[PDB]
Structures are given as C-alpha cells and as structure tokens.
Amino acid sequence: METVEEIKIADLRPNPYQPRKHFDDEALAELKESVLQHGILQPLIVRKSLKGYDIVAGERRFRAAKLAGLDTVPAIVRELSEALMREIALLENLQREDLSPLEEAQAYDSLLKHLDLTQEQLAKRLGKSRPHIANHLRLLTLPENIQQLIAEGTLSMGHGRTLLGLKNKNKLEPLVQKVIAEQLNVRQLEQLIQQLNQ
Amino acid sequence: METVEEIKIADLRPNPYQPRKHFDDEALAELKESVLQHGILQPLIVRKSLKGYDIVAGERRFRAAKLAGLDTVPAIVRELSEALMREIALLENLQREDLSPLEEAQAYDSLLKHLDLTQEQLAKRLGKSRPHIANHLRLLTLPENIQQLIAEGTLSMGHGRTLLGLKNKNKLEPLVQKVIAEQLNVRQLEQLIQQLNQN
Ligand SMILES: Nc1ccn([C@@H]2O[C@H](COP(=O)(O)OP(=O)(O)O)[C@@H](O)[C@H]2O)c(=O)n1
Ligand SMILES: Nc1ccn([C@@H]2O[C@H](COP(=O)(O)OP(=O)(O)O)[C@@H](O)[C@H]2O)c(=O)n1
Ligand SMILES: [Ca+2]
Ligand SMILES: [Ca+2]
Ligand SMILES: [Ca+2]
Ligand SMILES: [Ca+2]
C-alpha cells in the first residue's frame, strides 16, 4: 500500500527528463491561485535519489507551491528505473483529454448555480480570470444548434466567439451555413459580420 | 496518513458532478493501452458514499481499467463536502497545461533514441498510434523558426504538416507570413501549396 508523503520543497530536484520546455508565467499564476484556494489536489510523483527527490510528475505544482508560500508538497515516492522515469514523464501529460470549451462553459454555469456565486466569485475560487469565465459563459447564449455544431467540431470555438459579435441575428443561421459550406476561417467571418452589422 | 488503496471496480460509482459529456472511444482505447503497459500511474480521487465510492476524479481511468480487464484501481479516499466535490470535478481537469506539439515531438524523438525503439515499438509502449508518433516527428524537419511558431501556437500542427508538402522551400517564409497575416486555415494553405507546386 502506497502513501502520500509531504515532501519539503527544499528536498525536491528538477525532473531530469522534463518534456516541458516553456513555463508560462500566467498559467503558473493560475495554478498558484488554485493552490491557495484548494491546496495541491493531486500528489506529485517523485523518485528518491542520493541528493533528494527527483520530480517525475509535478514541476508546475512545485513552482506553484513555492509561489503560494508552501513549504511542502504531497507526493507519492516510487522506485523507478531511468526508462520508466523517461516514459512516465511524458505519459502523465500525454495520456489525458482536456474538456472542450463547451464542457468548461457548462461547468462554470453549473457551479454558478449550485455554489450560489457571482462570476467574480467563481473566478477567484477557480483561479481563472474573470474574462476567461465570462467569455466561456457567453458561448451558452448562442443558439442550441450552433452549440451542437461547435461540440461536434463542425465549427471552431473561435467561430463561436466571433458569431457573438453579430448585431442582426436574422443573418446568424445563414452565416453559419456559409461558414461551413465554404470552410471560411475566423478572419473571413469577422469581416462578413462587420459589414452585416453595418 | 493519506494512503492509496486498491478499490474494486464493482464498488465505484460514477462522478455525480461529471463535467465530461463526451467519452471518445478512440481516446479510451489509447488510455486502455497505456494502462496495460504501465498500470494506472495516477491514483483516482474518490469519496465514500453510503455504499461504495463516488469518483471525484478518474472516470476515464475507470472505464479504461474495465476495458483492460482490471479488478481494482488505485484510489485516494477523501472526505469532501458537496461543494468541494463539484469544484474538484472541474479543477482537476481545468488547472493543467497540455504539452505543445513540438514538446510532444521532441519527447518522442528523445524516447526513440534513449529507449532504442522504432516508431511502432514506441507507439505500442505509449498507447498511441504509429502515425501519431511519425507525424509529430515530421515537425522536427521544419526550420527552427517555424517550429517555434508551432511551439507558441501561432501555427497549428496541421499547418506544420501541410507546409511539408511545399516543393520549393524558397517560398516557405513568404507563405508563412501570408498564413499568419490572413489567419488562413489548413485547407486554404493546402490550396495555396497546390498552386505553388504546379510551377
Ligand atoms: N497508464 C496511465 C496513463 C495516464 N494516467 C493518468 O490518467 C489521467 C487521465 O486524465 P483524464 O482527465 O483524461 O481522465 P480521468 O481519468 O481523470 O477521467 C491523467 O491524470 C493521466 O496522468 C494514468 O493514471 N495511467
Ligand atoms: N489546486 C490544484 C489545481 C490543479 N492540480 C493538478 O495540478 C496538475 C497540473 O498538471 P500540469 O501537467 O499542468 O503540471 P505539472 O504540475 O504536472 O507539472 C494537474 O494534475 C492538476 O489536477 C492540483 O494538484 N491542485
Ligand atoms: Ca514534471
Ligand atoms: Ca504534468
Ligand atoms: Ca472524473
Ligand atoms: Ca480528469
């Protein structure tokens, strides 16, 4: 039976097989904020070495914990060959599916209702910006069929966002059919919507 | 003392606050294949119900474990309020960053060399298709400045693939400048390359 250990930040060493080459400061601030709200929800995977503990999965969490003022992170300590460490460094990130834009928006909407929160309060609680939450919730004001098209992938989310800018909704559904039939890009749609609006 | 328990598949209940509405069969097969190679690497998070356990994070792992024929999954049992369960069901998915196409491609290249595997063998080891691996490795044949655009997300991986189809490499930089300024999609880039390749 494995345990989750609290490992001191001073004892942690970089992932020797780190596949991430860029650490976005904005995204780390989001993770920091979430850690301040909920703590680290997911234990790191680490491997005990002579000098300390090498991270196998969790470098962002580690950086977020430091930003948040924590002195330890939760971790599962495993004995692993170099080959397993190389594989798992990738697989922990590779073998997962993110939520779609619409699944995210529906989640925000469900939390607003069941947690009884404003969008500002939800952004704080989730560690996301207020514009990020508002832009996703706006997708839920599009016609049902267009939401379906976006989910099915027949329309991009970028098209969805651009469609919100249309003044006269009488042209909305013909505009979507044109986008699809002509495989228009988002910039072409922006330009059509500007004229229609004017 | 938080522990990882092996919990019987039969005792697990679906996530009451599941944000995922689409469970792609192809992606579940990939996860199943990875579970067969490595086991479940990340414990599920669950909460005790009146009987059994509700999944708080891990429904895809749960379904892949059924497809792989497992009897139990590793799980951390936590006491959580309803509010926390609703929050964590989203957050465990929301607060994470994917790898860029180039980071994925570089990782494959590294693993091929250091594990001394062919593309096919690596594909089996990782639970991905052989073309998925091969097609990401092709990105590494692009000029570094275009690789960077793909790394940053200014160009999509599909743009990258399509640009490989260009015969005259002297037209690459002007073509990319056009793609970016005019925000062209993959199909429109295909057509421009179609024309450039016909002399
Ligand atoms: N052999 C593997 C491959 C991936 N994983 C992890 O499975 C999780 C899949 O994430 P997900 O959001 O797509 O699906 P859920 O299982 O959380 O519903 C990730 O946290 C992977 O790191 C694992 O535990 N074992
Ligand atoms: N408050 C939070 C928010 C996210 N997380 C998890 O932090 C992990 C971040 O994944 P990542 O691949 O972006 O970064 P790493 O920390 O694995 O380097 C994810 O598994 C989130 O579920 C957490 O442990 N605590
Ligand atoms: Ca890591
Ligand atoms: Ca990770
Ligand atoms: Ca889940
Ligand atoms: Ca998940």
Burial class (CB in 10 A: 0-12, 13-18, 19+), A67: middle
State CA B10 to chain mean position distance: 28
Burial class (CB in 10 A: 0-12, 13-18, 19+), A36: middle
What residue has token string 């508002």? Answer: A134
What 8-state DSSP symbol labels residue B1?
Answer: -
**A181 contacts: CB under 8 Å, gap ≥ 6:** none
Buried b (16+ CB within 10 A) or exposed e, B157-193: bbbbbbbeebeeeeebeebbeebeeeebbbebbbebb
- The token pair that represents B70 in the structure block: 């497992």
**CATH code, residues B101-198:** 1.10.10.2830
Best CA proximity match to B43, nearest among A35, A87, A3, A19: A3
The residue behind tokens 């609006």 is A197
C-alpha torsion A93→A94→A96→A101, nearest 10: 90
**Three-state SS at A41:** coil
Among all bound ligands, the one having the nearest atom to the CA of A43 is 2
User: What does the alpha-carbon distance between residue B108 and residue B122 come to, in Å, rounded to a whole number?
Assistant: 8
Q: In the Cβ-directed half-sphere of B153, how many Cα atoms lie within 13 Å?
A: 5
Q: Position of tokens 């005790």?
A: B48
Strands B2-8 and B44-48 turn out to be unpaired
- SS3 category, B183: coil
Q: How many residues does chain A have?
A: 198
Q: Which two tokens stand for residue B108?
A: 């494959």
A7 contact partners, CB below 8 Å, separation of at least 6: A44, A46, A53, A72, A73, A74, A75, A77
Ligand 1 site-directed mutation target among B41, B44, B59, B99, most atoms within 8 Å of CB: B41
Q: Is A48 exposed, middle or buried (0-12, 13-18, 19+ CB in 10 A)?
A: middle
CA distance linking residue A72 with residue B61, whole number of Å = 28
A with B: how many residue pairs have Cβ under 8 Å apart? 162
Q: Which two tokens stand for residue B47?
A: 């909460």
Residues comprising chain B, all counted: 199
Instruction: Encode A67-135 in three state secondary structure.
Output: HCCCCEEEEEECCCCHHHHHHHHHHHHHCCCCCCHHHHHHHHHHHHHHHCCCHHHHHHHHCCCHHHHHH
Give the number of other CB atoms < 10 A from CB of residue A182.
Answer: 9
Q: Choose among B115, B156, B161, B112: nearest CA to B138.
A: B161
Tokens of B12: 């697990």
Q: Phi and psi for A5 in degrees, rounded to 5?
A: -100, 150
| Bridge partners, A76 (sequence order) | A45
Verify whether the Cβ–Cβ distance A43 to B43 is below 8 Å. Answer: yes
Ligand 2 center–CA A42 separation, angstroms: 6
> Please, what is the angle between helix A82-94 and helix B25-38, to 10°?
160
> Phi and psi at residue A52, in whole multiples of 5°?
170, -125
CB-count exposure of residue B42 (10 Å: 0-12, 13-18, 19+): buried
DSSP summary character for residue A152: T
Tokens 């989750």, residue?
A: A4
The reply to whether residue A103 touches residue B38, judged by beta carbons under 8 angstroms, is no
| Assigned token pair, B63 | 């379904």
Specify the amino acid at residue B167.
K
DSSP string of B89-107? HHHHHHS--PPPHHHHHHH
Q: Name the phi and psi angles at B13, rounded to 5.
A: -115, 150
Q: How far apart are CA B92 and CA B5, in angstroms?
A: 20
d(CA A43, CA A3): 10
Eight-class DSSP state of A170: G
String of b and e for A12-33 (b: at least 16 CB within 10 Å)? beebebebbeeeeeeebebbbb
Tokens 């909305």, located at residue = A172
The answer to whether B61 touches B31, Cβ cutoff 8 Å, is: yes
Structure tokens, A195 = 């004229």
> Does B57 sit in the ligand 1 pocket, CB within 6 Å?
yes
Return the amino acid letter for B63: R
Could you count the other beta carbons within 10 Å of the beta carbon of residue A10?
Answer: 8
Angle between helices A101-115 and A130-138 (to 10 degrees): 110
**Strand arrangement of the beta sheet that strand A44-48 belongs to:** A12-13, A53-57, A44-48, A72-77, A2-8, B2-8, B72-77, B44-48, B53-57, B12-13
Dist CA A95 CA A74 (whole Å): 22
| Alpha carbons B71 and B62: distance in angstroms, whole number | 11
Name residue A78's amino acid: R
The resolution, in angstroms to one decimal, equals 1.8
First to last CA, chain A: 67
Q: Is A98–B100 a contact, with Cβ atoms under 8 angstroms apart?
A: no
Tell me the CA end-to-end span of chain B in Å, nearest whole number. Answer: 70
The angle subtended at Cα A98 by Cα A95 and Cα A103, nearest 5°, is 150
Strand ranges in B33-149 using DSSP code E only, listed in sequence order: 44-48, 53-57, 72-77
Measured between CB atoms, does A126 come within 8 Å of chain B? Answer: yes
Q: What does DSSP assign to residue B140?
A: G
Experimental approach was X-ray
Residue B56 CB neighbour total at 10 angstroms = 27
Residues facing B44 on adjacent strands? B75
Determine the residue type at B194: Q
Among residues A85, A73, A77, A87, the alpha carbon closest in space to that of A48 is found at A77
Which residue do the tokens 């995977």 mark?
Answer: A45
Judged by phi (left if over 0) then psi (alpha if -120 to 50, else beta), residue B161 lies in: alpha
Q: Which two tokens stand for residue A2?
A: 């494995």
Residues of A designated catalytic? 59
Nearest to B95 among A17, A93, A127 (CB): A127
Topology (CATH) of A101-197:
Arc Repressor Mutant, subunit A (1.10.10)
Residue B120 pairs in a beta bridge with none
